């Protein structure tokens, strides 16, 4: 069928009160919800690796990707904190730590952070040099960049950046830090793997800069937009520093 | 690189001004690298105001050759300029910030075309306040902004007409009329306000003809 069979797997996220089985034990109601969230997350990040899932989920109609972005712009702090893990695991980005300050979660997404493979017993210098020193190929195609550029263009076309700005402003701090780091990673990937016409107007951010410069709105939204832009500049400086 | 190091670290501002002025459009393909933009970003936050003007003109010109470097610093600088406009109530700082905003909007047309609304709101609310430098400054900025963004200023041309005719005609002071006349002619060639102000303001043709004999 058209829009009712494959789109069932993103039903734990789109439906806020989702009941999968009609007769279940009422004692387990939270663990069942986390199990539904985990299985639906695995199914969503498993359909975006196949071309028949990418094309069928991003159809130009009322597709199943626009219902995934539209429920992200709704202030429900349980679905909104769970969709960010799906967005982090789709683009193969590392997850930050669960905190409220940007300067603590910015340090956990450092590419030169210590890992357990870099110890002397396992992988002393060679496994560290694989991570921090770059590859010798400067003209190889690297098909992963092709796939990530296609996925990023398909997500930007359905309005992901406006939804990320809305999650950054009108939410808690625990989710604002994670959405700010996600927006920084997407804006860094845009000026790296996207063509110039796709990515010469993304770095302006009109919906966030017009909120950070409007003195008619309440001052909390303006100040958190200015703080978000300062954190985006700090993330850009961290990205242009490099691994040490 | 030696010229940029000298223009950054020299004590007296005359050599710094000569260095920051001599790097014209012939060096546009070579100043858009990494370390040259990192030196110009140091040149942006200078003590004296003229080198700040010159560095923000160079960076607003350079911002389309390598936008990934220049976009966050220009967003932060635009927010700082509007915060200097509204929040700080000193006329000198507001004049300098209006001049800096006009340099940024004259050297970078494509980036500030989506930021027309709060900038024009701030400049109009600065023109409606209860030295003539700030007035001809903001007239030059609003003329360049009218030239950059066409047909999206039709919701603003009425208030601008009512303000600029009260500053043109019935001049209680000896203010600059040439920049007001240029600004009035600059927002009718972009918006398309052709025949309507002749009847909406029945004294416009008379005061436009009086300037030829006085």
């Amino acid at each position: 069928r058209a829009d009712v069979e494959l789109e069932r797997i993103l039903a734990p996220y789109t439906d806020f009160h989702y009941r999968h089985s009609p007769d279940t034990a009422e004692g387990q109601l939270k663990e069942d919800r986390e199990a539904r969230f985990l299985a639906s997350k695995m199914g969503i990040i498993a359909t975006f690796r196949s071309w028949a899932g990418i094309i069928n989920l991003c159809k130009p109609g009322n597709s199943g990707i626009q219902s995934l972005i539209g429920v992200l712009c709704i202030p429900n702090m349980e679905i909104r904190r769970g969709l960010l893990e799906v967005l982090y695991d789709i683009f193969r980005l590392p997850l930050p730590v669960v905190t409220e300050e940007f300067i603590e979660a910015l340090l956990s997404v450092d590419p030169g952070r210590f890992q357990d493979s870099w110890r002397l017993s396992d992988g002393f210098v060679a496994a560290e040099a694989k991570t921090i020193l770059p590859h010798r190929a400067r003209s190889r195609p690297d098909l992963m960049d092709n796939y990530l550029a296609l996925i990023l263009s398909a997500f930007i076309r359905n309005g992901l950046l406006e939804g990320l700005v809305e999650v950054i402003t009108n939410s808690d701090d625990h989710i604002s830090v994670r959405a700010t780091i996600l927006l920084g990673e997407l804006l860094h990937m845009a000026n790296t793997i996207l063509p110039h016409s796709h990515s010469h107007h993304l770095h302006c951010l009109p919906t966030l800069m017009n909120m950070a410069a409007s003195f008619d709105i309440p001052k909390e939204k303006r100040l958190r937009a200015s703080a978000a832009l300062n954190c985006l500049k700090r993330f850009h400086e961290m990205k242009k520093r490099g691994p040490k | 690189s030696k010229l940029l190091v000298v223009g950054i670290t020299d004590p007296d501002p005359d050599i710094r001004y000569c260095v920051l002025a001599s790097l014209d459009e012939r060096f546009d393909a070579h100043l858009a690298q990494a370390e040259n933009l990192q030196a110009l970003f140091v040149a942006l936050n200078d003590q004296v105001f003229e080198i700040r003007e010159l560095a923000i003109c160079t960076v607003g010109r350079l911002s389309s050759m390598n936008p990934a470097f220049v976009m966050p610093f220009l967003r932060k600088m635009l927010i700082q300029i509007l915060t200097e406009l509204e929040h700080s109530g000193i006329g000198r700082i507001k004049e300098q910030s209006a001049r800096m905003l006009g340099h940024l909007v004259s050297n970078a047309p494509r980036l500030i075309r989506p930021y027309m609304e709060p900038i024009l709101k701030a400049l109009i609310l600065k023109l409606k306040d209860p030295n003539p430098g700030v007035i001809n400054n903001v007239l030059a900025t609003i003329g360049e902004l009218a030239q950059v963004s066409g047909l999206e200023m039709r919701k603003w041309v009425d208030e601008l007409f009512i303000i600029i005719m009260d500053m043109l005609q019935d001049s209680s002071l000896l203010a600059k009329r040439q920049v007001a006349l240029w600004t009035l002619g600059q927002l009718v060639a972009s918006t398309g306000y052709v025949v309507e102000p002749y009847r909406k303001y029945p004294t416009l043709l008379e005061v436009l003809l009086n300037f030829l004999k006085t």
Binding site: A137, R138, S139, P141, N191, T192, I193, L194, P195, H196, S197, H198, H200, K240 | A29, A32, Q33, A34, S64, M65, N66, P67, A68, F69
Partner: peptide
Amino acid sequence: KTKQGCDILKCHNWDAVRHSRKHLWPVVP
């Protein structure tokens, strides 16, 4: 992977990346 290839693809409304992997921040030509 070449300039002629991107110029051929531009006529059929398909854009491409015009920079290499040498520099992180390449100046737009």
